[PDB]
């Protein structure tokens, strides 16, 4: 038949930060449309160990202390039907445009 099931877990689009902006927010409020969600988990699968995740157990998580690198955060949520879904997001960090001295 045709496709109907919508996105189970949406960890938002690609995240691109540019110093000094060393912090971002993973708003996953748009994970479901019809079937509500009663589970939220934010963890860093790949990337350098250091960043600090806040409210990981919430639809909206915050990661501070980001550096020029690649941070992969997987979002594991569940629906009324104990449906196990996963959704990661590529977080790239660029350097603050412009030269520097010191």
How does this structure look, described?
With 102 residues, this protein is mainly beta. The protein has a single domain (13-95), classed as Immunoglobulins (Immunoglobulin-like, Sandwich), CATH 2.60.40.10. It is 0% helix and 41% strand. The chain contains no helices and 7 strands. A 4-stranded mixed β-sheet has the order 1-7-6-3, with no helix packed on it. A 3-stranded antiparallel β-sheet has the order 2-5-4, with no helix packed on it. It is classed as structural genomics, unknown function. The entry lists the keywords PKD domain, KIAA1837 protein, nppsfa, National Project on Protein Structural and Functional Analyses, RIKEN Structural Genomics/Proteomics Initiative, rsgi, structural genomics, unknown function.
Keywords:
monomer; 102 residues; 3-stranded antiparallel beta sheet; 4-stranded mixed beta sheet; 7 strands; mainly beta
In short:
This is Dyslexia-associated protein KIAA0319-like protein. The protein is mostly beta strands and 102 residues long.
Topology:
Layout: E1 15-18, E2 23-27, E3 42-46, E4 52-54, E5 60-64, E6 70-78, E7 84-94
Rg, nearest Å:
16 Å
How is the main sheet built?
A: 4 strands, mixed
CATH architecture: Sandwich
- Helix content range: under 10%
Number of strands: 7
Distance between the termini: 63 Å
**Tell me, what is the CATH class?**
Mainly Beta
- The name of the CATH topology is Immunoglobulin-like
Helix/sheet category: mainly beta
What is the number of helices? 0
Which band does the percent of strand residues land in? 35-45%
Following the backbone from N to C, one meets helices and strands in this order, namely EEEEEEE
Counted up, domains total: 1
- Shape call: elongated
Q: Please give the order of strands in the largest beta sheet.
A: 1-7-6-3
- The CATH superfamily label reads Immunoglobulins
Subunit structure: Interacts with RTN4R. (Microbial infection) Interacts with AAV-2 VP1.
Function: Possible role in axon guidance through interaction with RTN4R. (Microbial infection) Acts as a receptor for adeno-associated virus and is involved in adeno-associated virus infection through endocytosis system.
Domain PKD: 8-96
Subcellular location: Cytoplasmic granule membrane; Golgi apparatus membrane; Golgi apparatus, trans-Golgi network membrane; Cell membrane
